Design a protein around this nucleic acid. Structure first.
Ligand SMILES: [Zn+2]
Lengths: 84, 191, 59, 95, 91
RNA sequence: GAAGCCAGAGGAAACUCUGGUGGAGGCUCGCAGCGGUUCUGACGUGCAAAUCGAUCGUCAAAUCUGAGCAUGGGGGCGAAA
RNA sequence: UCGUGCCCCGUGUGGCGAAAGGGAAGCCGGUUAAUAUUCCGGCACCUGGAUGUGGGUUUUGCGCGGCAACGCAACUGAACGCGGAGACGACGGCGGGGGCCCCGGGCAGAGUUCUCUUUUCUUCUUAACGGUCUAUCACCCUGGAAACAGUUUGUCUGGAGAU
RNA sequence: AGGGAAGUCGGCAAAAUAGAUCCGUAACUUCGGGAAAAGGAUUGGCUCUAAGGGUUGGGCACGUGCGUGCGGUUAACAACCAACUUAGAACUGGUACGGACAGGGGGAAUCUGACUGUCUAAUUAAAACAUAGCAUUGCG
RNA sequence: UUUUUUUACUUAUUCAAUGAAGCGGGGCUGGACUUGCGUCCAACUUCUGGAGUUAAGGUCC
């Protein structure tokens, strides 16, 4: 069929950096770190980090995209916004 | 036709000093009798270079450095405000107002002659190719020299096909039917 | 698109600007760069000497 | 005067004509004078000046083109730059 | 071995367009098809590419010039009086 | 058979003559194509609401042609009938 | 970490519009009543993804060789830039390659045969994809050309380096 | 058949010419043309002759098929291979020889539009239109 | 207080340009004239078809 493009499947879809995850959840960094601790979201390590993000370094933190998608449904997010 | 033939927009460098560009190509422009010059300048505000399209004066060549600004030298291909040139200097692509990127003396073999300066109110008297006299602001820029390609109209076209080729890329009406060859419904000269 | 299927050494020449500029043009670039930087140093030295002479004349 | 001096040098002394032989003479260090024609490319002109500065060899900028320099050397071909290795009977070096 | 007595390059037009028009077009055709000595490299290899554009086959330099000649007498006179005006301005 | 080029013979040279080379031109004979001159032509309720035959113009370009697209009636388009 | 912020960048703006323009990649043999570069067999290719093995590189951390043109199975390369390809008229003669046409010999088959005809005719094929050795232009090295030379059908090339 | 435009408003139509080789070609001219001007000689078959090409290949002294140092331009010679043109000659059939096919009639002038080109699809293709050239007007 | 004339201004309105990038007024430095210190005028790149981009650095923490 139609030719696939590079970087649209595989690890690039499987992982997100912390910056991407925080922007995706629309949280502040303290709230995101607090929520990751409370929900058990753990740092992950891709085989080739350049396939996920070309600006990644050794200190870049990665997470599972599905774990971030799961965090999208947590009722504590509305609690955070209500308290703000 | 790719790009219009204009000067650079009037910026800080041309207002207060000069900027150097390099002539990379001298190209034919369809519908225009005069060749164009592609000149690459530096952007003073970023890393990327800027390509401009000038009307090429006679004697310009590829690999030549030209200079645009107030302090640029009085040399063929350089772009200077009229206040920086002496009387009797001929120029091309002269701006009617400073920053309009050039309006006068643009066709092949034509030029504008700087007749006089009035420094008190900052005006410059110029002579156009039609022989008309004009007053323009002294900060209007012009390129030193004469537009290349002069003597083009000295050669007879000699053939309807050559006239057709000339006007087909120009959009001008060709062939031309006389009004007296028409019926009265078509032309006032008709009949 | 066939260049995406062959390896890097086949698409280039082992030299600066290899596969983009030719050897003669690279040699011209090297000589021009060296000579222009040397001339810049010479002009800077001459300008400093003229500035020192002007300062001595003013003082 | 430079044309008559060049003719005398051609008659009596020893020269090499051309860019590569001029460079070889400058590298050998036996070059006494270098003549560079007016229409020589500025990059080659700067390179010849740098070589002469290294070898402590004088440079004369010939006001004619390479055609005129070849004619002044008495040849039927162009010459952009040339090297005098022996002045012969002329006084071209004393200037 | 001269093949025509006067028409020269205008012999391709035959008996058409008039003698005076053929004579007028002949001078422009001769100048625009001639080879010229390059002012940068000195070889006899400058030929017209398009109207007003003259290219050297040896050194690959392209120069803006006249329509049917490499240089225009008005442009040469312009260069001379420009050099005079530059001397007056600098001095 | 145009410029350009080679050789030979002259000419102080510029040039001249001779033999070649070369392959220009809204040049020319002419096939296809495009067009449509002529014929007491065929046909005339036709094969056809414009066709058929012979003859003819043009044939390297102001040549022929497809598709896509634009111009719409107080209009358009028109080498103008 | 004054935790609920800060930094960098500038170019704009979406869509439709070509079964003849641009464009990633498939060939051969066989097969049906009717389809076939689509089915079947054999032999391939492109695009994208994941992750191994071998091999390579590295203790002189990111290969080595060649004067050079450059070569070799590898041989890091973000932002931001430069360049190339895509990507381009018409006509003329010249040279190379495939296919077709033509000629000769040979095996096999067919026809002619009153006479003649060692005869006339037919089959004799090799794909994509790869390996390997070569192929005009051009470029590099040596060297320095008039008694000018090289050279195309077509007069261009050479101290800006020819032969 | 014979005559050869006597026919007819009018040579309408038909006939005649036609390829190629050679000889030769006026006025006029914008010097390019006119020009295939005009007007002539010839052409089958067979058997020969002549001319026009390609490739390969040189002797010593040493080291050992290449390297040198020499020596020579009669290879102007041999061997092998190959195709189509051109010219010349004899012989020979004839009512025909570009044997079908294919294929300009030519010339003297006048008017007219410069030329190539274009239009009234379905009655007019032209001195009409366009064209290059020339001239005028408006516009900074 | 009003009517005409011209003669300035800018805030409506109008034109143009730009990626809305350096306008206006001072300060610093240099040059001139002046008066015995006010003006105006200048800062910055010109032998070469190279390159210029991720702030180097100083100084307080
Ligand atoms: Zn040149």
């Amino acid at each position: 069929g139609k030719a696939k493009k590079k970087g649209k499947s595989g690890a690039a879809r499987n992982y997100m950096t912390r910056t991407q995850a925080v922007k995706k959840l629309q949280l502040s960094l303290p709230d995101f770190r607090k929520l990751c601790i409370w929900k058990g979201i753990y740092p992950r390590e891709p085989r080739d980090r350049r396939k996920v993000n070309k600006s990644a370094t050794a200190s870049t933190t990665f997470y599972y995209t599905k774990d971030i998608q799961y965090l999208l449904h947590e009722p504590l997010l509305q609690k955070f916004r209500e308290q703000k | 036709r790719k790009a219009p033939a204009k000067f650079r927009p009037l910026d800080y460098a041309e207002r207060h000093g000069y900027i150097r560009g390099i002539v990379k190509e001298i190209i034919h422009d369809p519908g225009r009798g005069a060749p164009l010059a592609r000149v690459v300048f530096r952007s003073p505000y970023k890393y990327k270079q800027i390509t401009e399209t000038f009307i090429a004066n006679e004697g310009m060549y590829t690999g030549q450095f030209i200079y645009a600004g107030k302090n640029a030298a009085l040399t063929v291909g350089n772009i200077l405000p009229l206040s920086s040139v002496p009387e009797g200097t001929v120029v091309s692509n002269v701006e009617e107002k400073p920053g309009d990127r050039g309006a006068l003396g643009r066709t092949s073999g034509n030029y504008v002659t700087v007749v006089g300066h009035n420094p008190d109110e900052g005006k410059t008297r110029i002579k156009l190719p039609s022989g008309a006299k004009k007053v323009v602001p002294s900060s209007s820029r012009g390129m030193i020299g004469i537009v290349a390609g002069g003597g083009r109209t000295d050669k007879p076209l000699l053939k309807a096909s050559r006239a057709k080729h000339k006007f087909a890329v120009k959009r001008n009406r060709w062939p031309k039917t006389r009004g007296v060859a028409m019926n009265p419904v078509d032309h006032p000269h008709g009949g | 698109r066939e260049y995406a299927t062959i390896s890097k050494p086949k698409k280039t020449v082992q030299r600066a600007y290899g596969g983009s500029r030719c050897g003669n043009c690279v040699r011209d670039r090297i000589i021009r760069a060296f000579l222009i930087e040397e001339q810049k140093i010479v002009k800077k030295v001459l300008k400093e000497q003229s500035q020192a002479e002007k300062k001595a004349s003013k003082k | 005067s430079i044309g008559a001096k060049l003719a005398l040098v051609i008659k009596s002394g020893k020269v090499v004509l051309g860019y590569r032989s001029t460079l070889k003479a400058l590298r050998s260090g036996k070059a006494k004078l270098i003549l560079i024609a007016a229409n020589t490319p500025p990059l080659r002109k700067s390179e010849l000046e740098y070589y002469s500065m290294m070898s402590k060899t004088p440079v004369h900028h010939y006001s004619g083109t390479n055609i005129e320099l070849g004619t002044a050397c008495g040849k039927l071909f162009r010459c952009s730059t040339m090297a005098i290795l022996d002045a012969g009977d002329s006084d071209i070096l004393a200037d | 071995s001269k093949r025509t007595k006067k028409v020269g390059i205008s012999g391709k037009y035959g008996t058409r367009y008039g003698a005076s028009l053929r004579k007028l077009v002949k001078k422009q055709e001769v100048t625009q098809h001639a080879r010229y000595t390059c002012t940068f490299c000195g070889k006899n290899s400058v030929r017209r590419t398009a109207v007003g554009i003259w290219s050297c086959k040896s050194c690959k330099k392209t120069m803006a010039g006249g329509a049917y000649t490499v240089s225009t007498p008005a442009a040469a006179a312009m260069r001379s009086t420009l050099r005079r005006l530059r001397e007056i301005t600098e001095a």
